[PDB]
With several copies, the nearest count.
Chain A
Amino acid sequence: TWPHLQLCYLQPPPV
């Protein structure tokens, strides 16, 4: 037992 939330970008975020 070991966890991982995934982040991805469908467009560039506000910067």
Chain B
Amino acid sequence: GVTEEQVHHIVKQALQRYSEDRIGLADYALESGGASVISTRCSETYETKTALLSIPLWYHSQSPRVILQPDVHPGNCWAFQGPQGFAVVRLSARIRPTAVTLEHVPKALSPNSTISSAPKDFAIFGFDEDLQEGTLLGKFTYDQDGEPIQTFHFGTYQVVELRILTNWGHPEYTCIYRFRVHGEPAH
């Protein structure tokens, strides 16, 4: 038996956590917070024919910059061709990495209610010398039947690599909506 006051308390705490980037964890991969993509060491951006800006000025693609951007309506993803691809992000701050968060559009928002283009198995690599060969921080697999946002728990790093090894079966590309990196700053 729960009282009214305890219902108001439970929703107020739940809207606070919602308002706190949905999962209440600082994101050191968040561009506005001062992170950037090593655009040279990212997978080739699948750009193809699609979006023209007019008056035909210009063909529109999605830079990998967006995987570090919060807006995750459908289409606001970075897309590479095939089921393998990678990105190297310089975190806003040298931290000891404790978790990553991946997120895809909800099925209810995506047509035919399937999210074929989402990443399946991925892996995370630290790069001690920003310079070096990656140190495997951990492998995980994003769960197409899971929630849109899923966070995954595992030395300080400022450069990290999200490596996607498989996708959930799209024959042409893989979309990455948002990638996050959590952890504690050094002492």
Contacts and interface: CB of A to CB of B under 8 A. Distances in A.
Interface of A: 1-15
Contact of A14 (B52, B55, B173): B173
Given A4-B39, A7-B31, A9-B36, A14 B49 contact: no
Contacts of A4: 39, 45, 61, 63, 65
Interface residues of B, number: 39
B49 A12 contact: no
Interface of B: 31-36, 39, 45-55, 57-63, 65, 74-75, 77, 79, 90, 92-93, 105, 110-111, 117, 173, 175
A9 B39 contact: no
B54 A8 contact: yes
B52 A8 contact: yes
